[PDB]
Specification:
heterotrimer; A alpha+beta; B alpha+beta; C mainly beta; B: alpha+beta; four-stranded mixed β-sheet; 21 helices; 20 strands; about 15% strand; C: mainly beta; Methylamine Dehydrogenase, Chain H; eight-stranded mixed β-sheet; dna binding protein; Base-specific contacts; B-box
Chain lengths: ~600, ~550, ~525
DNA sequence: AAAATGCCATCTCCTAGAATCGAACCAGGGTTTCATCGGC
DNA sequence: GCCGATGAAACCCTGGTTCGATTCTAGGAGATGGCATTTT
C-alpha cells in the first residue's frame, strides 16, 4: 500500500517528549501541544488527492482550567502550584462518549464536551488524595478512574442532571501503595474487565472491575524496582511493559513473567496489533522498531509494517540535511496512536540533527504519518463516522469486509422492526443495528447518500400508531416519507402552518407529495426540506451534515413550531449525529 | 426562475462577497445577491432575508459608516440614509485563510495581497499590478505570495514586457488547458542541442531549425530562439558556422554546429570561557581579513545556533555608528560585507579595524591598568553601615525547657530582637562597496582614464575584482556616485548617446573628446567560422532551394 | 485562561484572605509571601526563623559563632550524598582505584604547566610568582585580610573542598581542596577544550592540604589522568574509609562520570600519580554525560549532550533507572534541590535556554518551566539549601534566586557589568559568592532577599565586591584590587556583556562548608591564580 | 495614627516574528548595425 | 557593379524577481511610585 502525504503541522511546540497524540472515536486527533491542545478536526472530501491535509484541519483548541487546588499549599509534592497558570499535560478522549478528559500541570482531571468543562473531578480527603497524576476511561461503560499521590485509584461514575447533562460523582477507591507510603500512581490501563496500574516505585497491580463489585481485590503482579516503567499496555490479558533495556510480558492467567532485553536504552512505545490472530505488539523507538510475539517466551521478528516507511522518509531527509554523514541525526517521535478501530496508526514525528540549537515557536514543524497496520479492515463499532472514512482512505480506498451478499437494499434489523419499543428505544435499536453502520459508511463512498432503509423503519413505526398521528408536523413528515417510499399515507388533504420570527408560511399537506428536495407554500415561495424530517427549512437555525450537506432543523433553537411526538422525537434524537453518515453535525 | 437555496447557504454566499470586496458591501449589493434566490417583492421575505444576514454574530451594519442597532424593520423602511454590511476582522481572516488573524501564520502584508487577489475575482490580478495597487515593494511581494500561494492558483504571463504571475483564488482554478501557455526558450535548450546533435552532419540552417521548432509563430519566440542559439554559442554548447553551398560557392547561410551536450563537523565552543571571549579569539586569529558572522557561527557553534549567537553578540559587538563606551583593551567592530546578494557583518578586533579604516595613522599604544578603588573602609564598617531591617514575619523563642518554638510576629507578646565609513578617503557602506570603488579606480588608470559606464566596463571591473558574480548597473552607479562625492571620479552625460561617462579628474577634455571619437563606429556583430564542400540537413524545402540555387 | 475555587489549607493567612496568587507582585504581604513560597510546616518555618534571626544583620559578612553547632542559629543542611556511609556499597576490593607513581620528568612529558612566571601586583607588592608558588596577602588598605594566592600553572576548570569536620586521622583545623588543572591555558578557543564531542588528553587534579587557623597550605598529590578536562568536581561526602582522604567525583570530556579514591600519603611529601583506572565510571553507549548531581549516597542524576537525563544507581551502574529527553540540546548544568519536608526535585538548564524543575518520580507529570534564557554556553546553577532556592544566572549578567517550590517567585539578587561565570553557596549560611568575566568577586545575602517582603527590594538588597582581577596588556601583569565596592540591587537593568582579558574571568568559587573552616572560600581565574581568603 | 497591603499607571527593556533592502540575475523588447537584395 | 533601402541579428537597457540576514515593531513583563484603605 502507498501512504497518504503526511500532514505538515507548523509553529506548534510540545513541552516534553512523551506520547502527545490521541485519536478520538469520531476521528478527531488531539495533540497535547503547549500552551494549548491542538485538534485535528476531521473533514470530509470525496477526493483527498492522496493527501492527509484533506482529512484533518489542525487548529488551536483553547480550554479554561479551574484549579481546585490553587488555595492549597503544596506539602510533599513541592511542584504542586509551583507554576500557578494551568495548562494541559495529558488529554484522553472517551472510547465511548462525546467527551475528553484533560490532566492539567497542577494535577486536576477535568472532563470537557466541546470547549466546555463538564466536571472537575474531586473527592474529600488529604491533598495527596486530591492531586492526580494519571487517569483512564472505562472501555465498556461511562466511568473514569484517576490515580493520586496516595497511590490509590479513585473511580468516578456519570449521572445525568435535569438538562440531561452528565455529572461525574466519586464512586469508590482502592489503595495500591503501602500505608504511609509516598508512591504515586503513574500509569493506568483498562482493557475489558481488567484494570492494571503502576506506582512511581514501578510496582504493578491488576484488578478485575465490574458493576457486581464496589471495591475489587488488587494483586501485585510485578515487585517494586528502580527501572522506571516507560509504557504499559494490555494485549489478550497479557500485560506488556517497557523500561530501560527491557520489555516484560506478564500473563494475567498464570501471573508468569517472561522478559526480553532490548538492544537500546531509548524509550520504546508499545503498539498492540489487536487484529492479528497470534498475540503480538510493535515496539517503536526513535532509533528502531521490532515486532514481538507474546508467546510463553517473547520472540522477536522484523517490523515489516511501519519501519520501511520511516526509513524511506529518513533517507530523503538525510539527502537534504545530512549529506556526507557530517552530523549525528535522529528521528524524534512526539506521539503514536492507533485509530479507534485499531486498523491504522498515526505517528507524529520530526527529524533532527544533534546540534547546539535554540528554536523559537515560528521555526517549529512536525509531520504526522498515517499507515495501515493490516491488509484488510472492517467497520468497527469502536469507531464512528469520519473515523471509518479515514480508515477507508488509509488502505487506499479498499472497502471493508462486509456480510455475505450485502447490498444497500437490505432492511435494518433484517425487517424485524421492534415496533413494541418506545420511540427513543426504537430509534436506538435502529442506530445500533449492524446494517445501519454499513449503510452509513457506504453513504460516504457513493455520490448521493440515501436513507431509504431507515425511512422504511420509520414508516413501520408510523403505520403502527397510525391513530396517534394527530399532529400536523408529524403528518407532513410521515406523508413525505410515504411519498419517498411510494406507499399509502395517513391523510392527503389539510394544511401545515410553519413559522419563523419574520414570516409565516402555510403549506397544503397535498404539496408534501410533489418534490423530494423542495416544497412550495401557498404563496409560491419554494423552500428546501429538512434531511431527517422532510419538513421545510424556513430558518438559518440548522445543523449541516458534513458529508451529505443535508440541513437538519435544530429543535433546540425553534420554540415557535408545535412539533409532535414523532417529528420532535426524530429532531431530538438526531440533533448531534447525522442519520446519513453517523458524522457529528456542523452548527450554523 | 428564482433559484432555491438554504437560508444559511445565502448567508455564506453574502459572506463570500463581503470577503472579495475588501470586508464591506452596500445594502443594495445584498439585494442583488439575495434577489437571485428569494422573492424580495414580499416585505416579509425581504425582512427574513435581511434577518438571516445581519443577525449572524460576525456581521456588522453601518449607517453612513457608523455601526447601528440592527432594527431590520427600520433598515428596510429607512430611505433617509445609506446602509452597508461588513464583517469582523477574524471572520474576514477565517473566510479568506481558514484561520483567525491571531492563529493564521500569513502576516498582515501577505493578507493585504490576498484581499486584492480576492477582490480581483475570476479575472485575477498580475504580480506587477498587485504590487502597484497595494503599494508594496516588488522586492517583497513575491516572497509574501509564497506564504499565501496555497490559497491561490497562478500561471505565467507577459505584461508590460515582463514575465509575471496572474493570481486568482484557488476556487477559480480551471481544469481546461490554457489558450496562451507561456513558453520559455531556456526550457528547450536540451531539445535544440539534441536536434542539432541528431542532424545529419551535426549542423543546421538556423532559419530551418527556427521553422521546424515553430518559433517563427511570435516575434518574441523568434528573438528568444536566436538569443538561445547565441547563448549556446557563447557557452560553446553549440557553435555558429557559415556554410558555403557545395552547389553554388557564392551562397553562404548562417548555421549552427553541435559541440557538446548540456568525516564530522567540528564545533569549537567550550564551557570554560565566556562566549564573547571565544568570539574575540577567532576575530583576532582572522587578522586584517576579519571574519564573517557566518564563519564565526559555523566554527564555534554550528548553523542551528546562528540566531542565539546573533541575539547574544548584539550586547558586545560595536557598529561604527553608535559605538559603545571605550573600555579599551578588547573590542570587536562589525561592518557590512557582501557575498553576492547576502549582506552580513564581518567582525574585526579594534587593532585590525583601525589598520583597515585608518591605514595611514599610528598603531595604538597598549593599555595598562585602570586606577584602583580609593575606598579604605573595612568589611565590619561596611556591614554595619549598609544594614536595612527586614519585615518581621517568621520568629522563634526558646522555652524554659530549652525547646525552640516557632511563631509568626504578633502571635506571641514577645518583643522583636532586631553611517558611511571613511576607509582613508573612500567613503563606503560595506567592504564590498569599498572593494568595488577601489577596483573601478584601478581599472580606470589601466584602460586610459576614460570609460563609457556600459556593460563592457562592468565586466572589466568584475574581471579585476576576480568576481564570478557580475556587477549590476545599479551597483556600479552607486559606487560611481560615492567616488564623485569624494572627487575621485568626474562623471557626465555624453550628449549624443546619453550614456554616463566617468573620467579621472587628471584627464583633459582633449582625451575625453578623443575617447568619444574612438568609441564612435566601433565594429561589432562580426562574422563566425566558415565551412565548405559539405551538406546541410533541411526541414524546409525553401531553405534547401536557397542553398541549391 | 484560569479560575479559582474556595477549598483551602487550615491556618493559612492566604486561606483567610482568599486572594488568587499568579505573580510575585500579588504577594504584597510579607507573611503571605513566606507562606506561599515555603508553606506552613512548623519545623521548616522554625529553620527559616533561625536563618532569619541569625543572618538578617549579616549584609556582607556573618559572625563565625552562628555557624558553630552550639549556636541557637546553627542550621547545617547536609547534602543527600552525605546521608549514609556509601563506601562499602559503592566501592570495595572489586572497585579500588588503580594508580602508579610517576616522577616529575614523566609528569612534565605529559603535562606542560606554565613555565613563564606570572607578574602579580597586590597592594604595594609587585612579584613574579612561579608555578606552584603562593603569595600571602600583604599589608593591604581597607583592613587586615588573611589568605594567599597560589599560581596553579594552568587553566583551573573546577575546585572542590572536602567538607570533613574531623576524622580518626584528620584533626579539626585541616581541610583538603581538589583543583582541576588544564595545560590548554591562555587560549579561549583552543581545539582541545571543545564541549560537544568526546575528547581524551592528559590533564591533572592537584590535592591541597590546608590549615584553617594558620592558612598553611601544601600540595600533597598530583593525579595525572587521561579523561580530558573535568568539571562538576565533587567529593562524595558519604564515601569515607580509614585509608582515604576521600572519594572524588567529576564529569570529563570523555563524557563519563568518574570516581577516584584519593588515597592518603604516609607524609605531606608531594607525589605524582598516574590514574590508570578509576573506582567507578558511569557511561552510556552513543551519548556523552555533560553534568551530574547526587540524588542519594548511591544514586546520581546526570545530563547529556543530546538533552536526555538519566539516573544511575552507583551500586549497579551499567544501566540507568530512566533515560528520558528533557531538553532540545546540550544540558549545561543539573542541580538537586533537597529538603527534609518535600520530595527531592532536579533542575536542568541547557544551551536551548530553558530552565526546568522536575521530580524524578514522574518527569512527565512534574516538569515545571522556570524561564527561558537567551541561549548561552555558561549558566551556573547551585542550590542554596538554607533558603530552599536555586541560585542561578541568565547566562548574561543577572544573578537570580528561585525557590524549589513556587517557580513563579523569581527574585533578582544583583546585576553585574558582564557575564556571571561562577556561583558559590554554603550549607551553613545564606551568603552567595558570584564570580564574573571581568574578574570581580561579589558577596550577597540571599536570605535578605527571600525571607523579606516584595516592596523596597532595591533599597534593602546590596552586594559587595570582595576582589577584582585586572590584567595590563602593556605590562603583561595581573593586579588584584582589594578595595570594597557596594552595589545596590538595580531596577529595570539592561543586560550587559563586555570583553575583558582572557585570564581574568572567574572560573569557579566555592565556600568551605564546615563549622571550623566555614569562613574560608576559594576562587580561581582562567590564568590559574587560585585565591583563598579566610573572611574575618 | 502609623505601617502595611493592594492595585494601578507609567516607564523601560526584551523577545519573537515580520518586514526591509541590496544586489544579482534574467527575460523581453528596443535599438542599432550590418548584410543582402533590388533597382538603376 | 554600385549604392540605397529594408530586414534580421546582436547587443544593450530596464524592471521585476529572488533570497536571506539584519532590522524594526509589537506586545509583554517587571519594577517602582503613589494613593487609598485596612490592620495593628
Amino acid at each position: 500500500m502507498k501512504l497518504l502525504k503526511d500532514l505538515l503541522v507548523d509553529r506548534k511546540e510540545f513541552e516534553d517528549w512523551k506520547n502527545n497524540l490521541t485519536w478520538a472515536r469520531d476521528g478527531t486527533l488531539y495533540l497535547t501541544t503547549f500552551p494549548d491542545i491542538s485538534i485535528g478536526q476531521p473533514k470530509y472530501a470525496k477526493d483527498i488527492n492522496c493527501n492527509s491535509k484533506n482529512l484533518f484541519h489542525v487548529k488551536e483548541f483553547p480550554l479554561e482550567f479551574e484549579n481546585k487546588l490553587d488555595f492549597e499549599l503544596a506539602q510533599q509534592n513541592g511542584l504542586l502550584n509551583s507554576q500557578p497558570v494551568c495548562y494541559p499535560r495529558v488529554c484522553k478522549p472517551s472510547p465511548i462518549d462525546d467527551w475528553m478528559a484533560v490532566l492539567s500541570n497542577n494535577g486536576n482531571v477535568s472532563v470537557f464536551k466541546d470547549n466546555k468543562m463538564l466536571t472537575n473531578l474531586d473527592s474529600k480527603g488529604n491533598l495527596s488524595s486530591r492531586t492526580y497524576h494519571c487517569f483512564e476511561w472505562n472501555p465498556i461503560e461511562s466511568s473514569i478512574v484517576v490515580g493520586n499521590e496516595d497511590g490509590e485509584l479513585q473511580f468516578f461514575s456519570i449521572r445525568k442532571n435535569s438538562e440531561n447533562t452528565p455529572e461525574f460523582y466519586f464512586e469508590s477507591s482502592i489503595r495500591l501503595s503501602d500505608a504511609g507510603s509516598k508512591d504515586w500512581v503513574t500509569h493506568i490501563v483498562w482493557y475489558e474487565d481488567v484494570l492494571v496500574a503502576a506506582l512511581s516505585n514501578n510496582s504493578v497491580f491488576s484488578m478485575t472491575v465490574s458493576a457486581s463489585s464496589h471495591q475489587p481485590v488488587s494483586r501485585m503482579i510485578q515487585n517494586a524496582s528502580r527501572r522506571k516503567i516507560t509504557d504499559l499496555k494490555i494485549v489478550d490479558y497479557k500485560v506488556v511493559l517497557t523500561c530501560p533495556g527491557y520489555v516484560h510480558k506478564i500473563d494475567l492467567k498464570n501471573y508468569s513473567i517472561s522478559s526480553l532485553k532490548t538492544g537500546s536504552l531509548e524509550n520504546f512505545h508499545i503498539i498492540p496489533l489487536n487484529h492479528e490472530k497470534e498475540s503480538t505488539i510493535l515496539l517503536m523507538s526513535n532509533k528502531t522498531s521490532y515486532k514481538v510475539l507474546l508467546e510463553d517466551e517473547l520472540h522477536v521478528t522484523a517490523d515489516n509494517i511501519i519501519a520501511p516507511y520511516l526509513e524511506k522518509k529518513f533517507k530523503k531527509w538525510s539527502t537534504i540535511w545530512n549529506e556526507f554523514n557530517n552530523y549525528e541525526t535522529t528521528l524524534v517521535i512526539h506521539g503514536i496512536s492507533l485509530s479507534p478501530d485499531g486498523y491504522s496508526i498515526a505517528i507524529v514525528y520530526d527529524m533532527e540533527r544533534v546540534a547546539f540549537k535554540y528554536k523559537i515557536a515560528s521555526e517549529q514543524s512536525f509531520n504526522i504519518m498515517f499507515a495501515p497496520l493490516y491488509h484488510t479492515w472492517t467497520i468497527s463499532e469502536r469507531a464512528v463516522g469520519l473515523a471509518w472514512y479515514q480508515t477507508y482512505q488509509i488502505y487506499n480506498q479498499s472497502l471493508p469486509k462486509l456480510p455475505e451478499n450485502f447490498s444497500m437494499n437490505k432492511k435494518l434489523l433484517n425487517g424485524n422492526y421492534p415496533i413494541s419499543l418506545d420511540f427513543q428505544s426504537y430509534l436506538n435499536a435502529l442506530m445500533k443495528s449492524e446494517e445501519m453502520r454499513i449503510i452509513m459508511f457506504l453513504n460516504m463512498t457513493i455520490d448521493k447518500p440515501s436513507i431509504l432503509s431507515f425511512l422504511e423503519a420509520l414508516y413501520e413505526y408510523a403505520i403502527n400508531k397510525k391513530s396517534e398521528l394527530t399532529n400536523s408536523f408529524d403528518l407532513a413528515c410521515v406523508l413525505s416519507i410515504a411519498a419517498i417510499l411510494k406507499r399509502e399515507a395517513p391523510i392527503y388533504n389539510g394544511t401545515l402552518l410553519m413559522k419563523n420570527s419574520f414570516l409565516e408560511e402555510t403549506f397544503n399537506l397535498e404539496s408534501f407529495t410533489a418534490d423530494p428536495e423542495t416544497v412550495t407554500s401557498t404563496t409560491n415561495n419554494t423552500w428546501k426540506r429538512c434531511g431527517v424530517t422532510l419538513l421545510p427549512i424556513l430558518t438559518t437555525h440548522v445543523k449541516i451534515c458534513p458529508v451529505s450537506k443535508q440541513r437538519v432543523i435544530d429543535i433546540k433553537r425553534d420554540d415557535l413550531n408545535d412539533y409532535g411526538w414523532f417529528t420532535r422525537g426524530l429532531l431530538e434524537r438526531f440533533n448531534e449525529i447525522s442519520v446519513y453518515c453517523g458524522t457529528t453535525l456542523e452548527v450554523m | 426562475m428564482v433559484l432555491t437555496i438554504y437560508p444559511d447557504e445565502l448567508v455564506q454566499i453574502v459572506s463570500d462577497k463581503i470577503a472579495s470586496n475588501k470586508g464591506k458591501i452596500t445594502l443594495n449589493q445584498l439585494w442583488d445577491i439575495s434577489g437571485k434566490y428569494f422573492d424580495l417583492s414580499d416585505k416579509k421575505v425581504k425582512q427574513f432575508v435581511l434577518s438571516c444576514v445581519i443577525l449572524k454574530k460576525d456581521i456588522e451594519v453601518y449607517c453612513d459608516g457608523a455601526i447601528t442597532t440592527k432594527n431590520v424593520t427600520d433598515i428596510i423602511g429607512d430611505a433617509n440614509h445609506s446602509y452597508s454590511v461588513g464583517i469582523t476582522e477574524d471572520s474576514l481572516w477565517t473566510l479568506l485563510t481558514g484561520y483567525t488573524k491571531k492563529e493564521s501564520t500569513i502576516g498582515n502584508s501577505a493578507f493585504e495581497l490576498l484581499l486584492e487577489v480576492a477582490k480581483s475575482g475570476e479575472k485575477g490580478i498580475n504580480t506587477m499590478d498587485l504590487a502597484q495597487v497595494t503599494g508594496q515593494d516588488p522586492r517583497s511581494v513575491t516572497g509574501r505570495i509564497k506564504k499565501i500561494n496555497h490559497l491561490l492558483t497562478s500561471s505565467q504571463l507577459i505584461y508590460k514586457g515582463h514575465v509575471v504571475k496572474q493570481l486568482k483564488l484557488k476556487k477559480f482554478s480551471h481544469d481546461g488547458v490554457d489558450s496562451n501557455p507561456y513558453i520559455n526558450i531556456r526550457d528547450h535548450l536540451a531539445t535544440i542541442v539534441e536536434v542539432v546533435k541528431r542532424s545529419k552532419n551535426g549542423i543546421r540552417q538556423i532559419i530551418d531549425l527556427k521553422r521546424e521548432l515553430k518559433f517563427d509563430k511570435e516575434k518574441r519566440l523568434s528573438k528568444a530562439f536566436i538569443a538561445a542559439i547565441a547563448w549556446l554559442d557563447e557557452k560553446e554548447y553549440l557553435k555558429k558556422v557559415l556554410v558555403v553551398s557545395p552547389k553554388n560557392p557564392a551562397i553562404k547561410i548562417r548555421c549552427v554546429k553541435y559541440v557538446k551536450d548540456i568525516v564530522k563537523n567540528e564545533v569549537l565552543l567550550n564551557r570554560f570561557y565566556p562566549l564573547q571571549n571565544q568570539t574575540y579569539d577567532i576575530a583576532d586569529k582572522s587578522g586584517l581579513k576579519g571574519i564573517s558572522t557566518m564563519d564565526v557561527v559555523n566554527r564555534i557553534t554550528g548553523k542551528e545556533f546562528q540566531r542565539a549567537f546573533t541575539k547574544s553578540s548584539e550586547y558586545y559587538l560595536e557598529s561604527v555608528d553608535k559605538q559603545k563606551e571605550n573600555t579599551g583593551g578588547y573590542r570587536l567592530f562589525r561592518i557590512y560585507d557582501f557575498e553576492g546578494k547576502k549582506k552580513f557583518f564581518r567582525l574585526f578586533t579594534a587593532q585590525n579595524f583601525q589598520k583597515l579604516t585608518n591605514a595611514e595613522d599610528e598603531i595604538s599604544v597598549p593599555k595598562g591598568f585602570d586606577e584602583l578603588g580609593k575606598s579604605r573602609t573595612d568589611l565590619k564598617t561596611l556591614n554595619e553601615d549598609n544594614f536595612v531591617a527586614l519585615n518581621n514575619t517568621v520568629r522563634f523563642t526558646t522555652d524554659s525547657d530549652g525547646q525552640d518554638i516557632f511563631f509568626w510576629h504578633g502571635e506571641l507578646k514577645i518583643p522583636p530582637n532586631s553611517k558611511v565609513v571613511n576607509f582613508g578617503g573612500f567613503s563606503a557602506r560595506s567592504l564590498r562597496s569599498l572593494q568595488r570603488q577601489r577596483a573601478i579606480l584601478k581599472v580606470m588608470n589601466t584602460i586610459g582614464g576614460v570609460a563609457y559606464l556600459r556593460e563592457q566596463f562592468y565586466e572589466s571591473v568584475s574581471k579585476y575584482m576576480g568576481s564570478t558574480t557580475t556587477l549590476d548597473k545599479k551597483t556600479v552607479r552607486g559606487d560611481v556616485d560615492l567616488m564623485v562625492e569624494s572627487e575621485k571620479l568626474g562623471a557626465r552625460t555624453e550628449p549624443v548617446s546619453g550614456r554616463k561617462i566617468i573620467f579621472l579628474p587628471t584627464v583633459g577634455e582633449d582625451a575625453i573628446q578623443r575617447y568619444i571619437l574612438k568609441e564612435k563606429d566601433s565594429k561589432k556583430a562580426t562574422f563566425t567560422d566558415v565551412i565548405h564542400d559539405t551538406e546541410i540537413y533541411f526541414f524546409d524545402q525553401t531553405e534547401k532551394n536557397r542553398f541549391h540555387r | 485562561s484560569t479560575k479559582n475555587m474556595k477549598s483551602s489549607s487550615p491556618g493559612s493567612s492566604l486561606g483567610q484572605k482568599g486572594r488568587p496568587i499568579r505573580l510575585l507582585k500579588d504577594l504584597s504581604s510579607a507573611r503571605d509571601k513566606i507562606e506561599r513560597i515555603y508553606g506552613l510546616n512548623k519545623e521548616k518555618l522554625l529553620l527559616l526563623a533561625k536563618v532569619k534571626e541569625g543572618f538578617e544583620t549579616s549584609v556582607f559578612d556573618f559572625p563565625f559563632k552562628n555557624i558553630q553547632p552550639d549556636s541557637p542559629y546553627f542550621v547545617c543542611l547536609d547534602p543527600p550524598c552525605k546521608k549514609e556511609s556509601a563506601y562499602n556499597k559503592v566501592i570495595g576490593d572489586k572497585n579500588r582505584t588503580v594508580y602508579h607513581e610517576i616522577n616529575k620528568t614523566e609528569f612534565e612529558n605529559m603535562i606542560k604547566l606554565r613555565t613563564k612566571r606570572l607578574k602579580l601586583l597586590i597592594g604595594e607588592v609587585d612579584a613574579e610568582v612561579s608555578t606552584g608558588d603562593k603569595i600571602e596577602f600583604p599589608v593591604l588598605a581597607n583592613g587586615k585580610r588573611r589568605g594567599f594566592i597560589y599560581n596553579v600553572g594552568g587553566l583551573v576548570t573546577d575546585i572542590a573542598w572536602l567538607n570533613i569536620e574531623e576524622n580518626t586521622d584528620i584533626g579539626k583545623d585541616i581541610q583538603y581542596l581538589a583543583v582541576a588543572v588544564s595545560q590548554y591555558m591562555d587560549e579561549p578557543l583552543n581545539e582541545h577544550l571543545e564541549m560537544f564531542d568526546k575528547e581524551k588528553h592528559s590533564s591533572c587534579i592537584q590535592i591541597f592540604k590546608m590549615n584553617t587557623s594558620t592558612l598553611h597550605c601544601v600540595k600533597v598529590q598530583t593525579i595525572v589522568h587521561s579523561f580530558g578536562e573535568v568539571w562538576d568536581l565533587k567529593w562524595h561526602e558519604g564515601c569515607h574509609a580509614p585509608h582515604l582522604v576521600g572519594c572524588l567525583s567529576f564529569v570529563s570530556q570523555e563524557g563519563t562520570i568518574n570516581f577516584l579514591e584519593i588515597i592518603d600519603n604516609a607524609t605531606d611529601v608531594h607525589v605524582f600519580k598516574m590514574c590508570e583506572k578509576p573506582s567507578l565510571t558511569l557511561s552510556l553507549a552513543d551519548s556523552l554525560i555533560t553534568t551530574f548531581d547526587f540524588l542519594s549516597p548511591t544514586t546520581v542524576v546526570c545530563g547529556f549532550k543530546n538533552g536526555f537525563v538519566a539516573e544511575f544507581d552507583l551500586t549497579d551502574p551499567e544501566v540507568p533507572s530512566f533515560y528520558d529527553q528533557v531538553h532540545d540540546s546540550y544540558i549545561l548544568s543539573v542541580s538537586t534541590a533537597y529538603s527534609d519536608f518535600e520530595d527531592t526535585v532536579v533542575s536542568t538548564v541547557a544551551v536551548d535556554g530553558y530552565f526546568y524543575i522536575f521530580n524524578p518520580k514522574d518527569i512527565a507529570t512534574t516538569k515545571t518551566t522556570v524561564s527561558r534564557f537567551r541561549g548561552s554556553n555558561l549558566v551556573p546553577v547551585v542550590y542554596c539549601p538554607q533558603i530552599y532556592s536555586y541560585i542561578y544566572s541568565d547566562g548574561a549578567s543577572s544573578l537570580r534566586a528561585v525557590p524549589s517550590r513556587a517557580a513563579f517567585a523569581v527574585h533578582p539578587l544583583v546585576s553585574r557589568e558582564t557575564t556571571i561565570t561562577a556561583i558559590g553557596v554554603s550549607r551553613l549560611h545564606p551568603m552567595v559568592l558570584a564570580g564574573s568575566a571581568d574578574g570581580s568577586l561579589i558577596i550577597t545575602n540571599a536570605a535578605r532577599r527571600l525571607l523579606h517582603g516584595i516592596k523596597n527590594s532595591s533599597a534593602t538588597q546590596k552586594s559587595l565586591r570582595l576582589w577584582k582581577w585586572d590584567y595590563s596588556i602593556k605590562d603583561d601583569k595581573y593586579r588584584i584590587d582589594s578595595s570594597y565596592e557596594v552595589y545596590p540591587l538595580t531596577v529595570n537593568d539592561v543586560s550587559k556583556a563586555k570583553i575583558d582579558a582572557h585570564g581574568i574571568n572567574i572560573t569557579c568559587t566555592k565556600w568551605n562548608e564546615t563549622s571550623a573552616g566555614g569562613k574560608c572560600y576559594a576562587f580561581s581565574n582562567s590564568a590559574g591564580l587560585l585565591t583563598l581568603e579566610y573572611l574575618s
